[PDB]
Amino acid sequence: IERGKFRSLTLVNWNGFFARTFDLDELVTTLSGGNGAGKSTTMAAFVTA
């Protein structure tokens, strides 16, 4: 009961992200932006962490 949750993700001094924090949704978080916006970059930050 009471599954642990990932609350937030922080990027520091990356290409395009000097300092950016995203508040992770409990159910679904949806990145949206044009090609090259850097969404793949964000998932990369996650997984590398």
Partner: protein
Amino acid sequence: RHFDVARILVDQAVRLGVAEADFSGLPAEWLAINDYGAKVQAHVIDTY
């Protein structure tokens, strides 16, 4: 319709300059923008 509005407005707003506070390292808060529980997280857009 509110959602379909919010999105569009943001699409129009983010093309207009940037927010200087975003380089301060201080995260912005989730300000409520209506009843029923809608929230937004964005710094003020200062630098046009």
